[PDB]
Design a protein around this ligand. Structure first.
Ligand SMILES: COC(=O)C[C@@H]1N=C(c2ccc(Cl)cc2)c2c(sc(C)c2C)-n2c(C)nnc21
Length: 127
């Protein structure tokens, strides 16, 4: 069994910038979710080998995790807030696509996703 390579977190070909909205995504949004008691499954890519999930990367073709998002934000990988918000959404959606309603991991993602929506609701206007 093998895991795919993780999503990239550095690419000199990719346009990027800092924006006050990206700063909020790191300092408020990512920091809030990262410290949550249910963050830990989401702090790195799914290890389909150790977890014995050989079908994971057949069903989830756009993997994403908060370890990758945190690196992307600390490395200033994004051009805009929407790119980063779409990474969070891909992470939650992947969890709901692979798992069953009411599974623990789905309750975990729902708790993180509730906080994420409450914080993104107050994304600042772009300076
Ligand atoms: C049988 O299905 C699973 O094991 C799916 C797996 N559940 C789990 C999981 C995580 C937490 C609990 Cl309480 C139960 C299952 C999982 C991860 S990553 C990781 C380190 C684990 C242990 N996960 C994510 C993220 N998305 N799906 C999963």
């Amino acid at each position: 069994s093998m895991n795919p390579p993780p999503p990239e977190t550095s690419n000199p070909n990719k346009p990027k910038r800092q924006t006050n909205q990206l700063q909020y995504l790191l300092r408020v949004v990512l920091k809030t979710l990262w410290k949550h008691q249910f963050a830990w499954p989401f702090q790195q890519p799914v290890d389909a080998v150790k977890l014995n999930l050989p079908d994971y990367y057949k069903i989830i073709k756009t993997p994403m995790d908060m370890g990758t998002i945190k690196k992307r934000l600390e490395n200033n990988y994004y051009w805009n807030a929407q790119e980063c918000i779409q990474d969070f959404n891909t992470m939650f959606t992947n969890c709901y696509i692979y798992n069953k309603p009411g599974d623990d991991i789905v309750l975990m993602a729902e708790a993180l996703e509730k906080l994420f929506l409450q914080k993104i609701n107050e994304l600042p206007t772009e300076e």
